[PDB]
Design an enzyme around this catalytic site. Sequence first.
Site, PDB file in Angstrom:
ATOM      1  N   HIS A   1      -0.285  21.019  49.852  1.00 55.80           N
ATOM      2  CA  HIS A   1      -1.619  20.607  50.243  1.00 55.80           C
ATOM      3  C   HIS A   1      -2.404  20.309  48.980  1.00 55.80           C
ATOM      4  CE1 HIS A   1      -2.718  24.703  49.292  1.00 55.80           C
ATOM      5  NE2 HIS A   1      -3.964  24.543  49.684  1.00 55.80           N
TER       6      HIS A   1
ATOM      7  N   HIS B   1      -5.216  21.256  47.531  1.00 56.11           N
ATOM      8  CA  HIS B   1      -5.725  22.228  46.579  1.00 56.11           C
ATOM      9  C   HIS B   1      -4.864  22.300  45.313  1.00 56.11           C
ATOM     10  CE1 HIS B   1      -8.174  24.304  49.973  1.00 56.11           C
ATOM     11  NE2 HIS B   1      -8.878  23.381  49.354  1.00 56.11           N
TER      12      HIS B   1
ATOM     13  N   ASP C   1      -3.711  24.868  44.058  1.00 58.50           N
ATOM     14  CA  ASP C   1      -2.700  25.901  44.007  1.00 58.50           C
ATOM     15  C   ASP C   1      -1.328  25.266  44.215  1.00 58.50           C
ATOM     16  OD1 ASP C   1      -3.959  26.146  46.636  1.00 58.50           O
ATOM     17  OD2 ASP C   1      -3.563  28.344  46.718  1.00 58.50           O
TER      18      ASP C   1
ATOM     19  N   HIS D   1      -5.432  25.743  57.050  1.00 53.55           N
ATOM     20  CA  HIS D   1      -6.002  26.049  55.748  1.00 53.55           C
ATOM     21  C   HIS D   1      -6.782  24.836  55.257  1.00 53.55           C
ATOM     22  CE1 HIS D   1      -6.030  26.513  51.256  1.00 53.55           C
ATOM     23  NE2 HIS D   1      -6.625  27.590  51.706  1.00 53.55           N
TER      24      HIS D   1
ATOM     25  N   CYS E   1      -0.282  27.984  51.458  1.00 54.41           N
ATOM     26  CA  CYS E   1      -1.621  28.484  51.718  1.00 54.41           C
ATOM     27  C   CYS E   1      -1.939  28.490  53.218  1.00 54.41           C
ATOM     28  CB  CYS E   1      -2.650  27.690  50.907  1.00 54.41           C
ATOM     29  SG  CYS E   1      -2.788  28.145  49.149  1.00 54.41           S
TER      30      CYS E   1
ATOM     31  N   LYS F   1      -1.624  32.818  56.127  1.00 57.73           N
ATOM     32  CA  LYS F   1      -2.672  33.667  55.576  1.00 57.73           C
ATOM     33  C   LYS F   1      -2.738  34.941  56.425  1.00 57.73           C
ATOM     34  CE  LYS F   1      -4.840  31.245  51.817  1.00 57.73           C
ATOM     35  NZ  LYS F   1      -6.116  30.728  51.283  1.00 57.73           N
TER      36      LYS F   1
ATOM     37  N   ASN G   1     -10.004  31.022  51.635  1.00 56.65           N
ATOM     38  CA  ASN G   1     -10.813  29.833  51.398  1.00 56.65           C
ATOM     39  C   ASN G   1     -10.864  28.991  52.673  1.00 56.65           C
ATOM     40  OD1 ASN G   1     -11.952  27.366  50.746  1.00 56.65           O
ATOM     41  ND2 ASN G   1     -10.553  26.907  49.056  1.00 56.65           N
TER      42      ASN G   1
ATOM     43  N   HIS H   1      -0.002  33.546  48.964  1.00 52.54           N
ATOM     44  CA  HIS H   1      -0.788  34.475  48.174  1.00 52.54           C
ATOM     45  C   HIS H   1      -0.357  35.916  48.474  1.00 52.54           C
ATOM     46  CE1 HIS H   1      -3.744  30.841  48.300  1.00 52.54           C
ATOM     47  NE2 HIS H   1      -3.145  30.787  47.124  1.00 52.54           N
TER      48      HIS H   1
HETATM   49 ZN   LIG Z   1      -5.684  26.081  49.313  1.00 55.39          ZN
HETATM   50 ZN   LIG Z   2      -4.813  28.781  48.052  1.00 59.38          ZN
END
Ligand SMILES: [Zn+2]
Ligand SMILES: [Zn+2]
Lengths: 220, 220
Positions: free
Chosen positions: B76, B78, B80, B138, B157, B160, B166, B196
């Site tokens: 995605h 982001h 990360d 997400h 991400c 979760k 976020n 995460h």
């Molecule tokens: Zn993200």
């Molecule tokens: Zn993230």
Amino acid sequence: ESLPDLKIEKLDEGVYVHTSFEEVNGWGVVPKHGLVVLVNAEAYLIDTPFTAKDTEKLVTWFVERGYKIKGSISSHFHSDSTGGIEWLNSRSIPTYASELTNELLKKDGKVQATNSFSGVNYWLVKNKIEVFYPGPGHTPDNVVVWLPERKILYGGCFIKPYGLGNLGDANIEAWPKSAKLLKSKYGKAKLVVPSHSEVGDASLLKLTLEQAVKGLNESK
Amino acid sequence: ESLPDLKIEKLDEGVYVHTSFEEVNGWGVVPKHGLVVLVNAEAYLIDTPFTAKDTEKLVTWFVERGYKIKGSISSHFHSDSTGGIEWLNSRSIPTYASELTNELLKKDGKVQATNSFSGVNYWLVKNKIEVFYPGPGHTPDNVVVWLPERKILYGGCFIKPYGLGNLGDANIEAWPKSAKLLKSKYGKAKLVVPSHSEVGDASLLKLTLEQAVKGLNESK
Ligand SMILES: [Zn+2]
Ligand SMILES: [Zn+2]
Ligand SMILES: [Cl-]
Ligand SMILES: [Cl-]
Ligand SMILES: [Cl-]
Ligand SMILES: [Cl-]
Ligand code: NA
Ligand SMILES: [Zn+2]
Ligand SMILES: [Zn+2]
């Protein structure tokens, strides 16, 4: 009704990691690593889960596998660590905490451990399970548990490598010093088990020490 | 002063977990799991670390042991997942992202992947590395990677389990449906891999669904 279950994943030989879960703060489901630690057939809780329920789960699992729970130690007053002391007391399994921890429990309206140690170290089990008090840090009372029949350290909520987290009861002036002394006398650390993170090594001491100083100037 | 270092641990037979670290906003030092995935002697990045540094470490590391980096996939838009796409592009290492990810990167002023894909599925490597798009969650662009031959799933991400985190780019209305889809199409997975969190099993789909529905009503 969607709190993930207790986890009991062997970390080493006579050394388990119990992982339990809860919300409150607003972090959502916070996981809590504690150790079970076997001595022959005697199990030892190295903190408790959050709840009575997951303590009974933790106890029965070991009880059922032919070990007989000989004691609990809680590493600081937060229910992170103390959550199961009520249960253990009602089953009159012996619970342990420092004078500082027991005084903080009393202040918090929270049933106290039925046994108190004090001072820099307690040999809960001679040669086998050591309590060490670095000094004020995460909380004023926080202590850690040393495994000499291996090289494992339970940092508990004291080890905070990604940022210090809950600060409400924290002594942030004192922490960097307490950290320093931990890194010092607890070098030779193979495993360093934090409360709220993955298991690491003796760097987590360095990483904590670092996170510690950072807060000391980021709030003055 | 001192970020934790990159970690590259063996997850399975040609499948690794790279862990990379960055301070994220008021969320502090956040760790980020991605996969390296080996086909023959060809290496694939399943997300990237946050930085070029950590991406270059990850890459040379593998090149070092004789594996050629055949591409990166980014789950995605982001940082990360995408943090490495510019380093990758500047070495002419092929980078993959969905049209949605690419459109979102461009929005974000962020260098885009040099290779674009679309649809529910995409076979990055026929039979071996599958991209699945559950739907918005997400983030609006939001893909997971299936590894058939090993039965592994990179959730990104999107998984979760402890709370959504976020939600700046989130789509919490739609997320529940998306996870419902993922749950179902992606049973026969014991190795789920959050972004995460700890690596877990199929219950992470249960738990994500749970977290998503919960934040659907807690957000009205
Ligand atoms: Zn993200
Ligand atoms: Zn993230
Ligand atoms: Cl009691
Ligand atoms: Cl204590
Ligand atoms: Cl104490
Ligand atoms: Cl980890
Ligand atoms: Na502690
Ligand atoms: Zn605490
Ligand atoms: Zn805590």
